Design a protein around this nucleic acid. Structure first.
Lengths: 116, 75, 136, 94, 58
RNA sequence: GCUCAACGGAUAAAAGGUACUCCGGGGAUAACAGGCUGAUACCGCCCAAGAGUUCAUAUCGACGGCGGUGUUUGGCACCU
RNA sequence: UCCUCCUAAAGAGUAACGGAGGAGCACGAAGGUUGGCUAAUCCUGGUCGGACAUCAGGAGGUUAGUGCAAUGGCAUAAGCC
RNA sequence: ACUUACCAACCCGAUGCAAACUGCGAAUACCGGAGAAUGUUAUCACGGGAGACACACGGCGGGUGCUAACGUCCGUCGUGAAGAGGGAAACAACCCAGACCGCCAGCUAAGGUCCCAAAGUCAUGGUUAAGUGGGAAACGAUGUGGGAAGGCCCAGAC
RNA sequence: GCCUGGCGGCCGUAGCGCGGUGGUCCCACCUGACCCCAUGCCGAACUCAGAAGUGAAACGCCGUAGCGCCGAUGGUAGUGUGGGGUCUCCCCAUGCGAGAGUAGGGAACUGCCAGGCA
């Protein structure tokens, strides 16, 4: 199973970040969307979330689900997270390779001020 | 043909539940990870679990495999 | 003589024989020879008693030996001192408690089962009794 | 068709049960349905000669306790290991 | 304020160390030593522990 | 830089005989005898397959079982 | 002398000329980290090809593996690249 | 390729066994915290002086032995050692009990009350006739007291 | 309110199996691959650019107890303390009291955020 293989790739860094107790920026890449949400150190409650399924992001994009869309989402999460006093997170790539548009999303979150 | 045994290694639980510890204190000297490391507990190279912060020893059972964690409550 | 085909360790500790038994109902057959005394039974006593039964109720019937030895008993030879290791495995016993159905029998009348179980209970060291297959 | 006169056990545990079997009785319980289980003591000889029949384990029994009647069925009997006597009987309501 | 009265009725010679400690907890020194204590479940647990060798009266 | 492996390592470096023996000790510990035990031994009994032309029990009694004795071979090391 | 299990009486420790086994090393990768992956065995189909060498699919679930004993561990793998 | 009283893997149902088996799991013990009463600080640390490092039996859990030994080796507790007194005839270690001294005073524990020998030849209801009590098993037996049933039976049973 | 996605609590009353249903959005399969990147061969996987097509598989949801799972009451085993016997084993008073099995329960419950529909 592809989804289950991804989750067992995620698990080590997930449990390590729950062990350190750092607020994590969980990404989630789908073939036509990217999702990004900032989660509290208790793991239960979210703080900030942006994604391409929001029409505030989706209307200003050509196609949700490429590197431009992901850069838009990273910029959005960094902006909202700085508006809510969150400065220093840890990036949870959530089982994907840090390569494509998760790299675009995280680089875009680092340009717009979010410290990781 | 017999008549040999090793020296007894003195494993086991050194600090029990609710027992106040200092940081650095060994909680369970053990052999695999019979007990796993929880919050504020470190696991040494020989799977010795030691108090990484001060507080109280908390034995728990977590997760999908029913593992036996050892936390430390800040106290 | 009965003996396990292949053990895991050759010599067993003595240990004790306490409490009551587990095999208690006549399970397979219809009549049963149930222990009352505690004791233990060598493989020669089980074989002796089974020959008494098989002779007694001739080659008709069907007989189940519900106990099996699987416990090795070691003895030291004669004019050997104490110490210098554990002895040697001489025979094999089954440990019996009060309640074990030692044997079962089916396919005979009850009066032959009485007769064969009398004939064979005189080859065993434990006090023994006759039971029937009770329904729940 | 069997009528088994019973009493209610005011005491229980292994002390009280072993005291109760030396007095030629034995404990029992009636559970099942929606009611609470009912601890019951039974005379021994009546129930032993009664269960020598086969119909004791198949037919609906009637247990008379405190002048009532509970139509039960004999669920499961603990017997003594090496003696012809009874330890305990579970009766499911019917 | 019930103040149960406790009496030692047997010797404490061959006894376990826990029972001699309990008789020292109750304050009993020799056979036939009536000693009165408060009636609390801690004292009652002590009387229960050595009930074979204390006659209690209330 | 040590199978200093007798592994808290006596020396860098060490095998035997003594019925020609000797001294201090020990019933802390053997040989005899006693004691405890009874595996073994001896004696007795229980079941009875069978042998006995037939017939288990006149006489024997397989497979097994339960004791007694303190008569052997032992075990222990309590007395010396 | 040292290691593992049992004896060992559910903390630790615990004896016997008690029951069983091992060590007196290996490795510059078999260590560090990062990224990834998941076994045994059996069934079916398939050139030489066979009970068993490779391929493909299924069942199966770690009965596998862990440099070397045994025990305790291990999937977040401590296993494999 | 054709037949077959023989054996039998795996799987399923039922039955047991395990110190070196565990998908379960006590009592107890142990560690930690709080609280009351009691205890001549009984606790810990440091310093002066030791002695001792042959233990024995008895209960409980075991190894060894033959679930042999007044055997041997452990764990734990008691006693002896180093503890007299009363009891078990006599009997370190078993049961009761811990002796500062005195008394021709009382009450008791274990254990006992016919005589040796202190105290019931006590009271009520049973049981055994074997001197059982006051050694010893498998097994044998119309000994004898009790209990619950059952077959036949004054259309006459044994 | 219903549905879907993410991250958790919880760790089988939560998992399996059999049957039914879902795609506007979401998700999954999908389409293509010269580029970013990748295969000890292979865009199968990883990755990128997309959205024609289908919900077949997958995943979710709804049923169904064939099984797994939970599980009393009672009794049994064991056992601490004291006592007793016919004492390699048990019994009594008393305190604790299982494992297995039975009746039964049972195809989860829930928090934060986000999107679609009413």
């Amino acid at each position: 199973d592809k989804k289950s293989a991804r989750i067992r790739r995620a698990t080590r860094a997930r449990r390590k970040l729950q062990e350190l107790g750092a607020t994590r920026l969980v990404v989630h890449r789908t073939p036509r969307h990217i999702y990004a949400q900032v989660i509290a150190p208790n793991g239960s409650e979210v703080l900030v979330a942006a994604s391409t399924v929001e029409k505030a992001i989706a209307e200003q994009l050509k196609y949700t689900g490429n590197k431009d869309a992901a850069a838009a989402v990273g910029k959005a999460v960094a902006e909202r997270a700085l508006e809510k006093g969150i400065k220093d997170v840890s990036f949870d790539r959530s089982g994907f390779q840090y390569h494509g548009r998760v790299q675009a999303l995280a680089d875009a979150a680092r340009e717009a001020g979010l410290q990781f | 043909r017999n008549g040999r045994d090793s020296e007894a290694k003195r494993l086991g639980v050194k600090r029990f539940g609710g027992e106040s510890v200092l940081a650095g204190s060994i909680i369970v000297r053990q052999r695999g990870t019979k007990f796993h490391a929880g919050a504020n507990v470190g696991c040494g190279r020989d799977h010795t679990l030691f108090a990484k912060a001060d507080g109280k020893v908390k034995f728990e059972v977590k997760g999908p495999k029913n593992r036996k964690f050892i936390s430390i409550e800040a106290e | 003589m009965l003996q396990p085909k292949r053990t895991k360790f050759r010599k067993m500790h003595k240990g004790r024989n306490r409490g009551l038994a587990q095999g208690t109902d006549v399970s397979f057959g219809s009549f049963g020879l149930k222990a009352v005394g505690r004791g233990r039974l060598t493989a020669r006593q089980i074989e002796a008693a089974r020959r008494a039964m098989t002779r007694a109720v001739k080659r008709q019937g069907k007989i189940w030996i519900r106990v099996f030895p699987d416990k090795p008993i070691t003895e030291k030879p004669l004019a050997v001192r104490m110490g210098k290791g554990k002895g040697n495995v001489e025979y094999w016993v089954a440990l019996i408690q009060p309640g074990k159905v030692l044997y079962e029998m089916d396919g005979v009348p009850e009066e032959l089962a009485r007769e064969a179980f009398k004939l064979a209970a005189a080859k065993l060291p434990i006090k023994t009794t006759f039971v029937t297959k009770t329904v729940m | 068709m069997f009528t088994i006169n019973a009493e209610v056990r005011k005491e229980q545990g292994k002390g009280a049960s072993r005291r109760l079997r030396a007095a030629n009785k034995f404990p029992a319980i009636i559970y099942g349905g929606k009611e609470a289980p009912l601890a019951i003591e039974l005379d021994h000889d009546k129930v032993m000669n009664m269960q020598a029949k086969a119909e004791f384990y198949s037919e609906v029994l009637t247990i008379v306790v405190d002048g009532k009647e509970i139509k039960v069925k004999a669920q499961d009997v603990q017997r003594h290991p090496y003696k012809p006597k009874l330890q305990h009987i579970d009766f499911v309501r019917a | 304020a019930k103040t149960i009265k406790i009496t030692q009725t047997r010797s404490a010679i061959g006894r376990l160390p826990k029972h001699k400690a309990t008789l020292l907890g109750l304050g009993l020194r020799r056979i036939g030593h009536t000693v009165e204590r408060e009636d609390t479940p801690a004292i009652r647990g002590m009387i229960n522990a050595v009930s074979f060798m204390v006659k209690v009266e209330e």
